């Protein structure tokens with residue numbers, strides 16, 4: 001997680017968020033530097049859960065070529081705020097996951113923040129239904145992040161090159 | 170839940186709790202009065218989840234023969250305390266679910282408490298792998314409950330009569 | 339607190355809440371039935387704290403003339419939401435305290451809610467800088483309460499009779 | 508805060524913790540690297556609160572000679588665990604504060620940890636009633652920290668030199 005001064009911001013989340021349309025495969029396009037993702041080519045796959053919420057399967061390609069994956073569960077603890085989820089990953093304490101913006105069919109912007117006294121730790125990802133996302137969309141989503149304090153100059157661009165990411169089966 | 174004086178107790182939980190062995194069908198035998206269950210013949214079915222934790226399917230037989238069911242997800246938010254679960258039901262805020270005692274194949278004692286200032290609200294249930302449980306076991310588990318202040322005078326016996334509950338299957 | 343169906347509502351809180359102006363003495367005028375206050379003539383006194391937040395001293399007149407008092411501390415855990423406080427009373431778990439509406443010099447409407455699964459427990463109080471409050475103000479504040487589902491049928495009127503409450507001073 | 512892999516540990520805390528004997532001045536002797544303390548000569552002063560808990564006044568000498576201070580409130584949210592406090596500092600989100608070990612008259616060992624998914628952020632301090640602490644005591648307290656995972660090789664020694672710290676009025 002990206003540790004910075006100041007308490008967590010509280011950005012607005014996707015109005016009328018429909019988890020049913022959010023399921024499926026999302027490709028990581030840009031992200032803040034964090035501790036969890038040590039590689040490239042990252043995807044998140046969200047699938048139906050027989051309980052509440054949905055289930056999570058994230059995969060990425062490490063620099064050595066190994067595919068690393070993690071499973072988790074996603075739950076909206078307050079059903080009146082379906083876009084404010086809590087993610088429970090194997091071997092991890094709970095972390096928030098807020099869908100800030102999505103059209104379900106092309107892009108989403110997701111954000112997570114944990115307070116650390118007078119500082120905070122945040123995740124943030126622009127994701128796409130395809131390995132790429134149009135630059136106009138990326139710029140708009142960067143606009144949203146800057147509005148609530150995210151230094152978009154620290155954003156990392158995720159490698160989704162078809163050849164490099166062919167290790168992703 | 171109904172309200173009793175005092176903050177929540179912190180009873181001991183099942184040592185080395187094994188959620189895989191806890192899965193399957195459990196019959197409600199006795200419980201504290203609460204608002205959630207308005208019927209009889211109650212069962213809880215716990216099943217594999219593709220994410221973390223396990224999935225929840227509770228069923229009961231309402232008085233006009235309807236079978237009311239609720240879905241949920243169960244997660245141990247601290248993996249080092251696997252008997253202290255959080256249950257997320259559709260249309261409910263999160264609630265604790267602590268497995269205080271179980272031999273997995275016959276009985277379990279489950280406890281849930283939420284603080285209300287200087288008072289608290291609790292659920293507590295004796296459950297069985299069969300629609301009945303031996304009086305000796307019931308009495309021992311009531312002893313456990315009384316050791317952290319649960320008045321056994323308040324426990325309701327659930328109707329598990331075979332004829333009455335036949336529509337459950 | 340006593341239990342009502344539904345999860346907690348999230349009513350709007352006093353904009354630009356100024357805790358310095360909120361300090362001093364407040365008289366209980368009307369409130370939801372609860373377990374905490376068993377007496378009449380109730381007042382809350384809020385005072386400067388050398389740390390953060392402010393200090394709490396509640397007093398009431400018990401039926402056998404005893405003046406029961408409780409001490410506490412009030413803290414706005416998120417400084418950006420100063421009207422959403424947490425109250426820490428001696429011998430109580432933390433409880434929310436939301437200033438929904440106040441003009442500081444005449445009236446305030448305070449609300450506290452804790453989720454109990456699909457149900458909730460709430461406190462709600464109309465308070466005044468005087469032992470009485472005009473009927474017009476009381477009626478407006480009941481309107482606010484009814485807008486987030488508080489049944490005004492349930493509100494108790496607090497005894498603030500001057501003769502009866504004389505031992506308060 | 509010191510950000511490291513793994514979830515927070517849960518060390519044992521001081522049995523029978525008596526906040527009344529913990530009040531007064533404590534000198535920082537050794538600490539984990541963190542973001543809050545940017546200087547040396549640090550002291551914490553704990554004083555009586557008219558509410559619950561106690562009030563907090565921390566001071567340190569920056570490298571430029573300026574004295575920097577912060578005020579806060581300390582509260583045991585669960586009165587049955589008086590050694591597990593929550594500290595509310597001005598401009599800061601709440602952070603835990605656990606008194607692991609103290610004899611009140613000479614030393615204390617304090618610990619704070621916040622989970623960050625599969626990682627965590629921790630504070631830890633050895634403090635003394637005097638600007639120094641005997642090496643035998645320091646080694647014992649380092650022994651306690653290593654037992655629950657704290658790499659005592661990362662500990663910083665706080666400058667409490669009488670000349671350098673004379674800026675502390």
Ligand SMILES: C=CC1=C(C)/C(=C/c2[nH]c(/C=C3N=C(/C=C4\NC(=O)C(C)=C4C=C)C(C)=C\3CCC(=O)O)c(CCC(=O)O)c2C)NC1=O
Nearest residue numbers: 028036042043044058059060068110112123124125624625
């Ligand atoms: C912004 C929200 C966000 C949250 C809440 C988050 C939490 C999070 N992601 C994790 C792993 C992971 N997270 C991802 C990828 C993603 N994870 C996502 O939420 C998204 C959108 C992607 C991109 C598709 C991968 C691939 C892993 C496994 C990393 C590995 O084990 O090598 C872990 C486990 C920590 C670990 O094992 O080291 C946590 C707690 N990561 C985030 O980016």
Ligand SMILES: C=CC1=C(C)/C(=C/c2[nH]c(/C=C3N=C(/C=C4\NC(=O)C(C)=C4C=C)C(C)=C\3CCC(=O)O)c(CCC(=O)O)c2C)NC1=O
Nearest residue numbers: 197205212213227228229237258259260261279281292455
């Ligand atoms: C002791 C712990 C305990 C907890 C934490 C609990 C929580 C709980 N049970 C619920 C429903 C329910 N709970 C049950 C039955 C059970 N539920 C159980 O945890 C067990 C062991 C049984 C019995 C085998 C049933 C049948 C319902 C559906 C009731 C209804 O709304 O019609 C709900 C509301 C779901 C909703 O309608 O939104 C909650 C919050 N009940 C408990 O008894």
Ligand SMILES: C=CC1=C(C)/C(=C/c2[nH]c(/C=C3N=C(/C=C4\NC(=O)C(C)=C4C=C)C(C)=C\3CCC(=O)O)c(CCC(=O)O)c2C)NC1=O
Nearest residue numbers: 286366374381382396397398406427428429430448450461
């Ligand atoms: C509406 C919000 C509200 C909250 C959050 C609340 C919480 C609350 N009030 C308490 C006591 C008390 N609360 C009051 C009176 C008041 N308390 C107030 O917040 C107000 C506005 C008044 C009236 C002016 C009194 C007199 C006591 C002591 C009651 C007793 O235990 O004898 C306690 C228990 C303290 C203890 O004995 O351990 C709690 C948890 N009461 C409320 O009414």
Ligand SMILES: C=CC1=C(C)/C(=C/c2[nH]c(/C=C3N=C(/C=C4\NC(=O)C(C)=C4C=C)C(C)=C\3CCC(=O)O)c(CCC(=O)O)c2C)NC1=O
Nearest residue numbers: 117118535543549550551565566567575617619630631632
């Ligand atoms: C191990 C527990 C521990 C906790 C929970 C902790 C929290 C904490 N300490 C802070 C400041 C501070 N904390 C201290 C010193 C101390 N603070 C202490 O808890 C102790 C024992 C000392 C030593 C006497 C000082 C001097 C400051 C002010 C730093 C500054 O503003 O320059 C802040 C405010 C953050 C900021 O303004 O940047 C927090 C949240 N620090 C800790 O060391």
